[PDB]
Structure 1
Amino acid sequence: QQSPYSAAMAEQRHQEWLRFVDLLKNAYQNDLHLPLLNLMLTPDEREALGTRVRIVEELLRGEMSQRELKNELGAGIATITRGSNSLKAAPVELRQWLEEVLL
């Protein structure tokens, strides 16, 4: 399956990663996370994260917005179809009265 080494390295990676998460967790409940993050990340890496959060918002707002559009269209067409069927179901009296308020 896997070497005795690669497995120890995999395990170490995981522990070290967990430890970072916990370090940052704790720093939060202490108001030290701004200092810690300055220690853990260069200025360019922080900018990069700041940039990535903005990218995520743009991707999300983009998709949200395409979705609201596709749903508007969907609903606009469904309403025409549904209007059509309901028109066929209307009683003659309603149909003629409607026809008559048209003419």
Structure 2
Amino acid sequence: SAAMAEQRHQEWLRFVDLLKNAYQNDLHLPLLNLMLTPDEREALGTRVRIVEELLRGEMSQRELKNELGAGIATITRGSNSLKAAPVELRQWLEEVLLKSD
């Protein structure tokens, strides 16, 4: 639904503002368990590792499937989205994932 991308954008921002508010309340853990599936939480964990490793540049896409157990399409998309990422984010992720904290 390209036609209804605006509604869908609004609906998404609602979720981000709710989570926002839960983090300031320390209710973020319960909210996240409520909103997401185990499957989804597992995936997110694994997406962190992909980005960390794409930022690292040491591993090849296939080593990445083997050592991380993430499907190739997840890697490819993870690759695409990072490039589209604003520089400011990229710098920050480097800082945190590969400068650690």
1:19-44 CA distance string (max 9 Å, x none): 01101111110111111110111001
Question: What is the Cα-based RMSD across aligned positions, in Å?
Answer: 21.1
Alpha-carbon distance in 1 for matches of 2:11, 2:91: 78
> Are the counterparts in 1 of residues 22 and 28 from structure 2 also a CA contact under 8 Å?
yes
Alpha-carbon distance in 1 for matches of 2:96, 2:15: 73
**Higher RCO (Cα < 8 Å, 6 or more apart):** 2
Alpha-carbon distance in 2 for matches of 1:11, 1:81: 26
Alpha-carbon distance in 1 for matches of 2:91, 2:35: 77
**SS of equivalent to 1:8:** coil
1:42-87 CA distance string (max 9 Å, x none): 0010000000001110111126999999999999999999999999
Pick the structure with more helix per residue: 1
- The answer to whether the aligner puts 1:93 opposite 2:88 as a matched pair is yes
- The answer to whether the aligner puts 1:39 opposite 2:15 as a matched pair is no
> Are the counterparts in 1 of residues 46 and 70 from structure 2 also a CA contact under 8 Å?
no
TM-score by length of 1: 0.51
Larger Rg: 1
Distance 1:65 1:28, change over 3 A: same
